[PDB]
Design a protein around this ligand. Structure first.
Ligand SMILES: CCCCCCCCCCCCCCCCCC(=O)OC[C@H](COP(=O)([O-])OCC[N+](C)(C)C)OC(=O)CCCCCCCCCCCCCCCCC
Ligand SMILES: CCCCCCCCCCCCCCCCCC(=O)OC[C@H](COP(=O)(O)OCCN)OC(=O)CCCCCCCCCCCCCCCCC
Lengths: 57, 459
């Protein structure tokens, strides 16, 4: 009772059911380093101007 | 300070917008009014300093220099408005603009509260006097004189900039009062010795110190009259003011590091007074006299005594006035006879009696006739130097003897004696130049009358 597959049938992506668990870390990755502690807060003006030598503002 | 700076700034649009028949009159009158406004800095009824703003302040040391600059601007205009009559209008206005810019920048330099701004205005004052000397000088050697002046000052001032940036990095602000309060004692290493030399050599160059004084005689000879006046009456004092301002953070190693410069000052004032004795050029003689007087100022600032500081301030003001007066008298003779030879014009007492009186009074101020502020400064410098070491009185006495000798030699060879009757082109006198001599002599008389104004920081 075998039927030859048509054109385009063997070449398509098929789902498959398995009881094998999904590997959570396939790359055996180490722990990612934490990012820099980003600074939050309101943007206050510069204290006493630019503070470039003798310039007041 | 802004009430003095702003109308001095507005003098430039007045210069460029005035009619060519009214430019000299308007600029001279409003610069006189500028000086009268600048006289309000003497209202010091307290021990505090008049800190006008965050970048401008007044001092018992800065105030006489500012008043002298504001007073010298109209005198420079009156001195220079005769050799520019055969001159283009835009060039005359440019010359007036150069003088006004010099006055503005010098006032800002003396009123500066921050040493980097002091250095910026130092070089800003370096520019237009170079322009004046190079463009309106008379002989060929004005170009070499301008190069010598510019590059002596620049090679001095570059390590000053490096030292100022180092002190700013070490302390934080480079503000004068902050440094004066949070002064730290240096540990006297080779790095600190080099730092000391870096922050002192610029001012020593512009004083000028002996051995590095070679820019001054040719610059003063080749300069026009206003350039000679502003040089000999403000810029050397600017060097001394820088020395007084920067010396507060150089403790304690200035005590032993001052040794070569004191010796250079004393022996150089003797040598330059000897050059004045044997000098064939009148402006060169006045220039070397300026070198000797500034050597006295150098020695006082190096020995760092309160008497020395007061004598330094009094000698600064007195020498500025009398050196400008001597240069103006020499320029009157130069505009008469078109020469600077010492011995060429001899019997000028006969033809110019009142000008001979001005010559005599200027020379008596030069040789420190009592009770003038010249003698006040020289005497207190001598007192402080004798306290520093009793053997300095020999060098001081030799310098005083040669000073009187060259001053009276100048008087005798320029006024006394038989008249050079071949000089047919001796115009009698200009009311302008007689007024210029009077405007030099009268403030000397008034400061002699009240010497408390120019005592300075220490007393
Ligand atoms: C008008 C005179 C010109 C010549 C003399 C000028 C001054 C001579 C003495 C000072 C050295 C040169 C200027 C250095 C400026 C900075 C000083 C400073 O910050 O010192 C502390 C610093 C030291 O830095 P520091 O203070 O941070 O030291 C760290 C110390 N510890 C680690 C203990 C905390 O000194 C220097 O960096 C000096 C290096 C100078 C090297 C280059 C010299 C070149 C030649 C100079 C003269 C060139 C012109 C003349 C040429 C000939 C003309 C005839
Ligand atoms: C021009 C004349 C030059 C020579 C004048 C006569 C010699 C002066 C010698 C001198 O300056 O002595 C003072 C000092 C003595 O040494 P001291 O006080 O022990 O300092 C410890 C140094 N680590 O000496 C020193 O600290 C040594 C470095 C002194 C440098 C002085 C300036 C030299 C010339 C610069 C221009």
């Amino acid at each position: 009772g075998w039927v030859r597959p048509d054109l385009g049938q063997l070449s398509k992506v098929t789902k498959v059911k398995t009881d094998r668990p999904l590997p959570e870390n396939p790359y055996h990755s180490r722990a990612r380093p934490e990012p820099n502690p980003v600074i939050e807060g309101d943007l206050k003006p510069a204290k006493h101007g630019t503070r470039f030598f003798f310039w007041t503002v | 300070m802004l009430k003095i700076i702003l109308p001095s700034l507005m003098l430039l649009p007045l210069t460029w917008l005035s009619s060519p028949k009214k430019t000299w009159t308007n600029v001279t009158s409003y610069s006189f009014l500028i000086s009268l406004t600048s006289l309000t800095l003497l209202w010091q009824t307290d021990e505090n300093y008049k800190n006008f703003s965050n970048m401008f302040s007044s001092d018992p040391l800065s105030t006489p220099l500012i008043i002298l600059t504001a007073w010298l601007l109209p005198l420079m205009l009156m001195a220079s408005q005769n050799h520019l009559k055969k001159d283009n209008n835009v060039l005359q206005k440019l010359y007036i603009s150069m003088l006004i810019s010099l006055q503005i920048l010098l006032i800002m330099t003396f009123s500066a509260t921050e040493l980097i701004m002091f250095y910026i205005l130092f070089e800003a004052t370096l520019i237009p006097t170079l322009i004046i000397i190079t463009r309106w000088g008379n002989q060929t050697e004005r170009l070499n004189a301008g190069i010598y002046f510019l590059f002596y000052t620049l090679i001095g001032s570059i390590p000053l900039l490096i030292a100022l940036i180092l002190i700013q990095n070490h302390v934080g602000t480079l503000n004068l009062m902050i440094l004066s309060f949070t002064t730290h004692t240096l540990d006297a290493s080779w790095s600190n010795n080099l730092l000391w030399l870096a922050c002192m050599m610029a001012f020593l160059i512009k004083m000028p110190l002996y051995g590095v004084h070679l820019w001054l005689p040719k610059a003063h000879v080749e300069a026009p009259i206003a350039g000679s006046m502003i040089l000999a009456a403000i810029l050397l004092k600017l060097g001394s003011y820088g020395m007084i301002r920067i010396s507060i953070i150089l403790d304690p190693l200035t005590k032993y590091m001052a040794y070569p410069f004191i010796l250079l000052s004393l022996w150089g004032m003797i040598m330059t007074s000897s050059i004045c004795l044997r000098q064939t050029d009148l402006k060169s003689l006045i220039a070397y006299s300026s070198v000797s007087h500034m050597a006295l100022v150098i020695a006082s600032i190096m020995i760092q005594t309160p008497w020395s500081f007061m004598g330094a301030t009094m000698l600064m003001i007195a020498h500025g006035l009398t050196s400008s007066l001597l240069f103006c008298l020499a320029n009157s003779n130069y505009e008469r006879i078109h020469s600077r030879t010492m011995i060429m014009a001899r019997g000028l007492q006969m033809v110019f009696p009142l000008m001979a009186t001005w010559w005599l009074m200027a020379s008596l101020a030069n040789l420190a006739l009592p009770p003038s502020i010249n003698l006040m400064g020289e005497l207190f410098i001598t007192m402080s130097l004798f306290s520093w070491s009793n053997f300095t009185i020999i060098l001081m006495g030799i310098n005083i003897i040669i000073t009187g000798m060259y001053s009276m030699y100048m008087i005798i060879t320029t006024q006394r004696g038989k008249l050079t009757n071949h000089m047919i082109n001796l115009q009698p006198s200009h009311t302008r130049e007689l007024t210029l001599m009077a405007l030099h002599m009268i403030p000397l008389i008034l400061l002699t009358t009240s010497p408390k104004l120019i005592t300075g920081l220490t007393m």
